[PDB]
Subunit: 304 residues, 6 copies
Amino acid sequence: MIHLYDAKSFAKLRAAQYAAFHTDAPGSWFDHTSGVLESVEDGTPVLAIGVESGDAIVFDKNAQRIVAYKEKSVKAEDGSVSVVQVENGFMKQGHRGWLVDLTGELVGCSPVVAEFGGHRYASGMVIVTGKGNSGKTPLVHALGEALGGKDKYATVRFGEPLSGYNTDFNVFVDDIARAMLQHRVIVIDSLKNVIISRGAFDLLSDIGAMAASRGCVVIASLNPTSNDDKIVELVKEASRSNSTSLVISTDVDGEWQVLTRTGEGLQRLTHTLQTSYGEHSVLTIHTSQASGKAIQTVIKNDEL
Amino acid sequence: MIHLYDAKSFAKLRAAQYAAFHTDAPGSWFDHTSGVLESVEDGTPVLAIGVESGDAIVFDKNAQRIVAYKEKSVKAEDGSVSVVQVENGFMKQGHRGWLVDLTGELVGCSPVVAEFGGHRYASGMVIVTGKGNSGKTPLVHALGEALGGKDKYATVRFGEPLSGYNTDFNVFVDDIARAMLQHRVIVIDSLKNVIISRGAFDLLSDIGAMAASRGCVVIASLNPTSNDDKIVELVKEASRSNSTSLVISTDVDGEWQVLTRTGEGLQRLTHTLQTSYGEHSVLTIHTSQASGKAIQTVIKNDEL
Amino acid sequence: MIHLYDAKSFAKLRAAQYAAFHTDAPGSWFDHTSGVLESVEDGTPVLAIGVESGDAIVFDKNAQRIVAYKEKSVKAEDGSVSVVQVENGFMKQGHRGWLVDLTGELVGCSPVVAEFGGHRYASGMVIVTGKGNSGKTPLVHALGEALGGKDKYATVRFGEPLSGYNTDFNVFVDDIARAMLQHRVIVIDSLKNVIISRGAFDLLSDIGAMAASRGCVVIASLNPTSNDDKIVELVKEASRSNSTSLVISTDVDGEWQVLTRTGEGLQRLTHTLQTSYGEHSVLTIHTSQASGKAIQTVIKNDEL
Amino acid sequence: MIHLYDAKSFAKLRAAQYAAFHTDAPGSWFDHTSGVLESVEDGTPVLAIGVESGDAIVFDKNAQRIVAYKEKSVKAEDGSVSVVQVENGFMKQGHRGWLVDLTGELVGCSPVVAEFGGHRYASGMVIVTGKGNSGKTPLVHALGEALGGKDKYATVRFGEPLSGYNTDFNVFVDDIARAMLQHRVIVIDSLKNVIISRGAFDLLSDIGAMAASRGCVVIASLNPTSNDDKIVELVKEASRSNSTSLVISTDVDGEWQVLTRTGEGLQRLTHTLQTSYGEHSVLTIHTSQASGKAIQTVIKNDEL
Amino acid sequence: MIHLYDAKSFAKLRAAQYAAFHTDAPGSWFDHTSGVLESVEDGTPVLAIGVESGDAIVFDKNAQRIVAYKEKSVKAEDGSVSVVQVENGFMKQGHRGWLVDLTGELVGCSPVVAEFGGHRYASGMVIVTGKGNSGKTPLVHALGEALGGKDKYATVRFGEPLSGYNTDFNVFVDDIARAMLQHRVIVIDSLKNVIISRGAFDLLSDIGAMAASRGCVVIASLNPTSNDDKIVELVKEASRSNSTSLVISTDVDGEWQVLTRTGEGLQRLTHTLQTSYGEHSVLTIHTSQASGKAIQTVIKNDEL
Amino acid sequence: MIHLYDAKSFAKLRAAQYAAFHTDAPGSWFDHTSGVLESVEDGTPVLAIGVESGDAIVFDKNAQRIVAYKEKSVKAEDGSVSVVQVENGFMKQGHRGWLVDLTGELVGCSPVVAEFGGHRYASGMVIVTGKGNSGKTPLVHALGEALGGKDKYATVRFGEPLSGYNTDFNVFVDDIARAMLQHRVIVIDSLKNVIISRGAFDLLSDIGAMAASRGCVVIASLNPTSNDDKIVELVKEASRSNSTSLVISTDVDGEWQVLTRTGEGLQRLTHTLQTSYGEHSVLTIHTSQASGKAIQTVIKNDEL
Ligand SMILES: Nc1ncnc2c1ncn2[C@@H]1O[C@H](COP(=O)(O)CP(=O)(O)OP(=O)(O)O)[C@@H](O)[C@H]1O
Ligand SMILES: Nc1ncnc2c1ncn2[C@@H]1O[C@H](COP(=O)(O)CP(=O)(O)OP(=O)(O)O)[C@@H](O)[C@H]1O
Ligand SMILES: Nc1ncnc2c1ncn2[C@@H]1O[C@H](COP(=O)(O)CP(=O)(O)OP(=O)(O)O)[C@@H](O)[C@H]1O
Ligand SMILES: Nc1ncnc2c1ncn2[C@@H]1O[C@H](COP(=O)(O)CP(=O)(O)OP(=O)(O)O)[C@@H](O)[C@H]1O
Ligand SMILES: Nc1ncnc2c1ncn2[C@@H]1O[C@H](COP(=O)(O)CP(=O)(O)OP(=O)(O)O)[C@@H](O)[C@H]1O
Ligand SMILES: Nc1ncnc2c1ncn2[C@@H]1O[C@H](COP(=O)(O)CP(=O)(O)OP(=O)(O)O)[C@@H](O)[C@H]1O
Ligand SMILES: [Mn+2]
Ligand SMILES: [Mn+2]
Ligand SMILES: [Mn+2]
Ligand SMILES: [Mn+2]
Ligand SMILES: [Mn+2]
Ligand SMILES: [Mn+2]
């Protein structure tokens, strides 16, 4: 909805967003939204996501698709009205994204999803990319495990010429919706095939906001390597504008840079990561600040 | 509609447009149009804005969507006829924009929306953009608070990978329409995702006139940073031709340049702004002229 | 229709075309076509113009839209047949342009529309463009007042982020049609937003011929400023091929060059204009020649 | 249809094509096809041409459109079958071009349309183009008059911002079809607006074959001047591949080069033309050989 | 269908493909397939070729179009099922190409179509192209006569601005289909207008296999001369990948190079041709080896 | 489906993937999946593959198309639901790929398909490409025979102007589906014509995963040779991202480099092959390693 502010309320909003990242208990936001989702009326539409054609499919709190749901409106605070209607498995009325309010007046946050090795990590979308020899697949799994902490992480596999990999986009959005509805830490191996159809465009522009709203983190690998400025710029734009955080390789093998948006209008943070391989390519991230706009685009050049 | 002029009536118009900006009491035009809107028959269509597909949705004076409205024509002064009809939630007949006359013979103005720190600010669309380290989000909010003055400003959020952010274009135009119907100072955080569908194109070409006609100001952030001459030029065109005013960052951190179109055929004005950060990234614009066409394009180069 | 010629009849045509610009009394053609339009049967379709979609709308002699008109054919001189039919507000059968014969055998002219400061001006489409500090909006209004002479000029406003400006293309063509049906001197402020849909393309290729046939002049502002060779070349093509005349700014502030097509196969004329500003940006054109094809393209370079 | 040959019959075919240009009486072919067209059953479809949409319209021998014609087939020599069917004014079955046989076994000719100033001119399509100061419009009319000889020439006007000019493509194809059905010498002023829709593409690829089959000549002006390699190459291709002859200006004002395809597999001929202006821009071509492929493309460079 | 191989059966295949070109009696494959076609049930579909839209038309063994044919399946050797159905003149079910097995287990051949002047020529598609003064039209006809030998060659004419030339793509595919069903040596004059619609694309990718399967040769002229890397590369690809053989002009007038693919996985052969002109441009090819991949692309450079 | 992991279960997966290539008995996975397919209920859909349009066709365990199959769902482990439905020959509900579970929790593998000359080869999609004189057709057939070992390899022929070659994309996918359903070693000759329609794009992004899941190897020839960065880059992307393995030619004639993806997140291996020709172009691969990301793109440069 729209929000109204004066100096006082805006100052309070910024203090709260700052806290959502810096001081809140890691993963508390996810716990809170999990509570909101489970308290919802059974059969109630909670999430809509775009399939390949640009049409949207809808899920309930248990990640089951809702095929038919007769028109039902809800008047918001600002006086606006939200309407949801599902027919023959497709959203007839409504919008893409969360169909129920998880945030409230608290918008524009990057809820801390976890703390690891002395650093806090934001929820939302994290894109892992870069050129060079440092492997991305091993990195997303190590990050997924590290941020999962006590919890297991969920893995969504898509578009790789390996066994058991789904290559159908519509099955992919189904997997993603189920993952965000049920887990705090999600790994997506290969955004490459989405990088273009309407659904693909919708996903890139929607996923970060969906995850951040839920308080879950989606770690997605994206390879730039494709000297075709048409696609390469799309990679830089996705990394620049649709990612809540960015994890990119450097000149030194095994070393990565983490760039994190800490909230609406807040400063981006950066820290480095050292890693090493053990048996069968299992990667481990070793354990034992503010970056400017210019520095940010400097890292973006790396992918050219 | 169309207007006829001879030397005398043209001179009066220019004198009137000149006063609408330079001498009228700040915000007086918004108050005047609020009165025109509230005098409209209940349920009467007053605003039509395009959704993603290119179709248009219609609202009444209370920002409520009209789903059905049987054909109804009106003959204007120049003998032209306006016809409005709404079926199944979409305009079957009519045009995008204000569906009632808010201006009359007084057209081509940039009504003063507010006065702050010794400067008059124009209603209409203001694009906040540029390259460098100066933050746009903190700036749009400080501007919103400064121009709101005694009134709260309205914030429309869209397309950011942060908690509670809407990413559905159709919800966005709904928020925008409601905001212009009810508030004088509006902040849109991130036009980035509009910059392309029919609705997006309609928005860019319509918002400035809609706001200027209402007497409200829409302060929208736009980031150029995207070395892709296809989009970067679309940003320069939007900053050049779709904005009533432009606020762009300079070589000096915290410093901004304001460029204002003061009316139809009138000169553009320019002034600088110094700013500083307080706690939690809350920005403050410090308190205590004519610019040629060439100087204008010089500022436009900054975005490359 | 098609016309047949031998050397004698061809020479006669050229002599008449030459006269239609050089010696006919200024504005006489407009008066003549006004008489033809008024002698038409009531309810008779006289003008069809394309809307955004590419479909066309129809008007009668009083600039009122015709919504229903059953099939009706008319056999011309060359034996050809013209058929007009209107159904549900749109032309079902017919063509875009004048639906009645305003010219007869006298085609290929640039009928003198007015005389001012010692120079004859041609009816048709006049594009006011160029780069630099000289302002186009003040110029088009000054030209409109000067060529109006004893008569008021009509102003069509479109696509500018100023108050009361329509931004809907279909309302725009309705405004243009009404203008050409009722006035000799017409100003269009901002052809920018048309420069692309089927209707926009239709307007650019049709308006020049429609105005010239009527004997009215349409003075339209068009800004090249947009370093995107895709659009900048479209601007040069409109100025070169869809304009009866061109008014472009020069190296000296306040000075403009007028380039006029005097008739089919005839030479282009050129003269200069000096201007100055008075109060409230009201511009005045001071009072007190054959140019070749190469000199013409040279001027076209100015827009790059 | 398809034709079968052995050395003897091929040699005879080439001798006959050579004669169709070099020794046949100028204009005899047109006279012969005129005879074939007039002997056709009344109401019989003789010509189909594509309108803007790509659909085709059909005419009878008197240039009147056939709106309904029930399926009717004809078995050719090679055993193939030709079918023509018209419904609601559009060809349901058939092909674009002549619907009746005018040539016979004699195909691949450039029938001499006229002789003037000691040179024979081919029927088919002649494109007049080039850069520089030599005027094209005056040239097509002078050529039209010269080749008309004792007969008047027909003029098709399209796409110019001058009075009485049709700018509707469908009216244009109607004018052209009528012209080819009724006259040996045809002038088309401005192919510019066709240079893109389906009908436009169909016209460029069909007109030369239609005219050559009829034995009439279509003199079309085409301006290259448009530094946009997308369109400029289209101009060179139209001049290179869709023109039976080419008339292009040179370095010397008033002088032109004529390049003529003399038949299938035969050599291209070239000759120069000197011209001068009299009153009101009426051009006169003064009165009192084989060119190679390489030389041909050298002339094509002129348009860049 | 699909074929299975082990070292032995693969060796036999290669020996068989090798003989199909090197030792079989010239034209014996065409005779063999004529026999297969004539043994087909009357009215049975034998060939489907794509028209402009992408749809396909079907012919029987006598080159007559089939308009209606109720579904009829056939199980092949590999267990695959072929189904054919024709409704309202268009294939409702089936595939493009030969609808009956003409080859069997003997696939991947370039059957010798004829022997002339001491050289064996392959059936399939032969593209005659190149730059320079050597004429293609005279060459395709001389080749047609030379390879026809005791038989007349068939000539399919398309897209030239000459008398009696068809310019309708659908008539063209009809002529081609008939020609391949009835003659061994076919000449297509001007593939230029195909070089793009679905039908055009289908033709380029299908004709070579269709001819090679039949045992007939299609000799098609193609002109590169069109400095537009978009089309020029389409010509090099067609010459490289869609042609069974290539005949290209050299630096010396009258001299040509012949490049022949001799079979699947077999080496390409090359030989030169000297030619001279007789009367009326009738060309004569004078009478009285292996080439690597790199040499091949070297010849391909000639077209730039 | 989606899978959850902790450090322990992740390590187990990597160990299994590693083994699936390095130590499992060659071809054992294919045998295992053959057993899964045969234990399926008769009439059960097991594979869906996209046709040209983008629609998909379905096959049962015996490679026979299923035309009608009423809705039928299956709930998986992650709680997800799979639904298959076939109507009028096309999938109404389902996804492309394997419609039954061949892998289970064991995903992300490159199952060893065979061992030859001391090297293990991975199942999945293998692209044979490169520039230079080394021939691809002889190589793919030699690789097919070598990896077939005791078994015959299957050959799918497509898009070559040689006898008996199918050129219809829909027949091609039918051939591929049948091949993967029935054989461990498959050769596709000429992926060239797919390199673009929806089905072609579907095949490129799906075949690798389909083959790997089955444990069969698809060896496909692909020629880069086509200096058109639009296609040449598509060739590099297919080799880089849609290939399980890559076989590319080098600077030395007859020598090839094999680059193998050994499993998800595992290292790529590389070895060289020497070859020689025998009679009739029958190629023989002579008998008697970790490569980095950078070394990989280096090899990719070879195709420019
Ligand atoms: N033990 C080890 N030592 C060094 N590198 C290793 C390794 N085990 C795995 N790797 C690296 O892991 C990397 C990633 O594997 P891949 O499946 O190629 C995903 P990626 O390369 O990160 O992204 P991509 O598939 O989009 O190119 C490879 O570069 C591989 O070399
Ligand atoms: N205390 C502080 N001192 C200096 N800069 C601060 C600051 N607090 C916030 N900022 C700046 O606020 C800026 C804007 O926040 P962001 O959310 O990135 C919007 P933006 O960068 O202006 O536009 P964008 O999101 O389209 O790129 C950041 O660049 C950050 O550096
Ligand atoms: N008193 C004055 N002295 C000098 N210039 C004046 C002036 N009053 C107005 N102008 C000029 O009037 C010009 C035109 O006004 P604008 O609204 O910018 C239309 P334009 O610039 O002609 O075309 P545009 O809006 O497409 O760029 C401005 O450039 C302004 O400098
Ligand atoms: N008396 C004369 N002396 C020299 N040139 C003359 C002339 N009379 C007419 N012309 C030339 O006639 C030419 C053609 O007139 P136009 O209407 O511009 C057709 P064009 O220029 O040939 O093609 P175009 O309209 O596509 O550019 C102009 O260049 C004009 O200068
Ligand atoms: N007696 C002769 N001596 C030399 N050349 C001759 C000739 N008779 C004909 N020619 C050549 O025959 C050639 C071919 O005729 P055209 O109809 O132009 C087909 P092309 O030029 O080979 O291909 P194209 O039409 O696609 O450009 C011409 O270039 C002409 O020079
Ligand atoms: N005995 C032999 N000695 C050397 N090379 C041979 C040979 N027999 C066949 N070849 C080579 O086999 C190669 C491949 O045959 P082609 O049909 O051209 C398929 P390709 O070249 O691999 O891919 P392509 O058709 O996409 O270009 C040819 O380049 C030919 O030189
Ligand atoms: Mn990876
Ligand atoms: Mn921002
Ligand atoms: Mn202006
Ligand atoms: Mn002209
Ligand atoms: Mn030719
Ligand atoms: Mn090959």
